[PDB]
Design a protein around this ligand. Structure first.
Ligand SMILES: Nc1ncnc2c1ncn2[C@@H]1O[C@H](COP(=O)(O)OP(=O)(O)OP(=O)(O)O)[C@@H](O)[C@H]1O
Ligand SMILES: [Mg+2]
Lengths: 489, 146
């Protein structure tokens, strides 16, 4: 069928920032409709508008996807007859798209079979899935304290330069490359150089074989993009992921970085729409936008979508409305702390502030659950003791309190791990720790069989075997120093 | 429906924190003057009239009842928030679940020190009354001495 408003002519009535009001003589088209500006205006690129509100029976307020420079009043606008639609299918694999779905990789035409609108209704209750599994990431902290669930929603909360991107790249390397299903990388308000680096990495690893069959799609709206595109690139990428999930019943990985910029772009456009700000200054519909976007990121009875999202915490204020509202929409939460990073511990995960849904004996093994709970209890007690330690001193503790402190310090050191992607910064070969190895090593450490091992032996290593090897090397160095000192006599 | 027909019901609201956000969104979009934390001025009255409908009818009206278990979320164990304080000042008690106790292995992480039931032993069976009465004193002494 053909829309009854396609080709409808309107004229620009008001221009303020990225918000443009269009007047239609025959009636404003439906909300979310895509409009194109026909006047040349001496622009270098085309201009597209999306209707977001109806001011009256004839006027509609829209948001521009490109810069509104050289835009005059009375400029002719023509409706496209529908919402913004993006290509879907296997033809999109290995390509780079933008908010509008145009291929920006400067390669041949996409030639997609069909397109689908970015705005869609989320799955209903009857379509929800009831499958719980464990996604092994190879990272000791995540696999132990906050294990990830296949087909679940994951979030990484952190400030500026804490390690969110590094963890995402590590997860990509450890999962997506060895992943049977497809992957979608949605860059929302991030550095453009990071997109180029990811594209080069995918091409080198043959994840995107331009001469063969690719298994990844890149959709990028970056910092340079105006607020209009940064509020819809996520929708377009999620639409592609939904098509892969439903129309093909394929497992999909959805890496979103960063999801905070979506809410920020929505707030920026809302400020221009003439809405009363909520607390801090975000739009009053902050919760509704996140609900509509996240509810679409779910695993239905047809397929599965394992989504990993990076959440930026402005000014390191975890109570900010944007990151605060995101917690309720995640199965696994990974909170990164700047102070932990400054102490040389990478990743900077704060285990006490992290949580997981599959931390259940009915899902994970009983031993895994018991070890994780014991580690959390030890860390909690050590945090309590640190308050006394930082004032009086370690020597003002009980005899058993000192043992708890030593074990907890070893645990904190042991949680660190060198990533295969951070070899430049760490200067050490990365490690990939198996789930069973992590459980065994932590269970042994809790029992106290490793009390003789030096504390620093646990710092920046993999499994227990790496700890023992580092301890052996340290012992050899110490023996050499002692021999040199003794011979000096 | 069951209360007005001599039957007892239990209502669980999970959770009133998000209802307040929805009401604030509706009020702000419809040009209502914002109040504390951008919430509408009559945000207390919302929950106040919601929770006043749960009661224990007299024997003359059937004797039915509705029990309310509203749920409220805090940030970093901060019970000084706006809506949290309003809800605390409305209900007949509060079960405070502490994060530190939850991570310390205590589950359910009921913070007995910060929890209170204003009904008291009146809402206890005869069998439980004596046990609870002695247990409360023992626990108070244990916490004081500990
Ligand atoms: N696992 C890690 N091991 C070693 N160094 C790390 C690790 N994670 C982060 N770093 C250090 O922190 C820096 C910033 O990391 P990253 O690019 O992940 O930041 P971010 O969390 O994405 O922050 P933003 O994108 O807001 O700048 C890295 O360049 C590196 O020096
Ligand atoms: Mg980053």
């Amino acid at each position: 069928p053909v829309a009854d408003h396609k080709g409808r002519v309107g004229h620009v009535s008001q221009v303020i920032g990225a918000v443009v009001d269009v007047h239609f003589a025959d009636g404003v088209p439906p909300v979310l409709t895509a409009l194109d500006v026909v006047d040349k205006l001496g622009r270098d690129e085309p201009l597209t508008l999306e209707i977001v509100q109806h001011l009256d029976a004839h006027t509609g307020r829209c948001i521009a996807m490109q810069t509104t420079d050289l835009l005059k009043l009375k400029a002719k606008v023509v409706s496209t007859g529908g919402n913004i639609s993006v290509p879907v299918g296997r033809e999109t694999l290995g390509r780079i798209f933008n908010v509008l779905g145009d291929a920006i990789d400067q390669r041949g035409p996409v030639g997609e079979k069909l397109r689908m609108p970015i705005h869609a209704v989320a799955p209903k209750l009857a379509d929800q899935a009831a499958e719980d599994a464990v996604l092994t990431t190879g990272i000791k902290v995540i696999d132990l304290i906050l294990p990830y669930c296949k087909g679940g929603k994951i979030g990484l909360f952190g400030g500026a330069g804490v390690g969110k991107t590094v963890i995402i790249m590590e997860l990509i390397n450890n999962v997506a490359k060895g992943h049977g299903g497809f992957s979608v990388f949605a860059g929302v308000g991030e550095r453009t150089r990071e997109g180029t680096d990811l594209y080069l990495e995918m091409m080198q690893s043959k994840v995107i074989d331009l001469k063969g069959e690719s298994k990844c799609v890149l959709v990028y709206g970056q910092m340079n993009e105006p607020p209009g595109a940064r509020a819809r690139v996520a929708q377009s990428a999620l639409t592609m992921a939904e098509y892969f999930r439903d129309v093909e019943g394929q497992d999909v990985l959805l890496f979103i970085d960063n999801i905070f910029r979506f809410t920020q772009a929505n707030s920026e456009v809302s400020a221009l729409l003439g809405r009363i700000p909520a607390a801090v200054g975000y739009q009053p519909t902050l919760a509704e936008d996140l609900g509509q976007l996240q509810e679409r990121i779910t695993s239905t009875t047809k397929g599965s979508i394992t989504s990993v999202q990076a959440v930026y915490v402005p000014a390191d204020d975890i109570t900010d409305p944007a990151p605060a509202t995101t917690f309720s929409h995640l199965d696994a939460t990974t909170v990164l702390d700047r102070a932990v990073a400054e102490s040389g511990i990478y990743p900077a995960v704060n285990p006490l502030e992290c949580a997981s849904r599959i931390m259940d004996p009915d899902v994970i093994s009983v031993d895994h659950y018991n070890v994780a709970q014991d580690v959390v209890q030890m860390l909690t007690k050590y945090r309590e003791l640190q308050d006394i330690i930082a004032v009086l001193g370690i020597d003002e503790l009980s005899e058993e309190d000192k043992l708890i402190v030593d074990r907890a310090r070893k645990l904190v050191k042991f949680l660190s791990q060198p990533f295969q992607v951070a070899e430049v910064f760490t200067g050490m070969t990365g490690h990939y720790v198996q789930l069973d190895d992590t459980i065994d090593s932590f269970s042994g450490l809790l029992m106290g069989t490793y009390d003789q091992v030096p504390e620093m032996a646990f710092y920046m290593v993999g499994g227990i075997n790496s700890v023992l090897e580092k301890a052996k090397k340290m012992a050899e160095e110490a023996a050499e120093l002692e021999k040199m000192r003794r011979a000096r006599v | 429906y069951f209360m007005n027909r001599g039957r007892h019901c239990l209502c669980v609201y999970d959770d009133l924190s998000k209802q307040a956000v929805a009401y604030r969104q509706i009020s702000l979009l419809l040009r209502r003057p914002p109040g504390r934390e951008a919430y509408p001025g009559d945000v207390f009255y919302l929950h106040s009239r919601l929770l006043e409908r749960a009661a224990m009818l007299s024997p003359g009206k059937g004797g039915g009842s509705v029990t309310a278990l509203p749920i409220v979320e805090t940030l970093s164990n901060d019970v000084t928030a706006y809506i949290v304080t309003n809800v605390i000042s409305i209900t007949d008690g509060q079960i405070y679940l502490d994060t530190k106790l939850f991570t310390g292995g205590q589950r359910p992480a009921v913070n007995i020190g910060l929890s209170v039931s204003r009904v008291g032993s009146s809402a206890q069976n005869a069998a439980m009354k004596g046990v609870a009465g002695k247990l409360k004193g023992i626990l108070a002494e244990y916490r004081k001495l500990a």
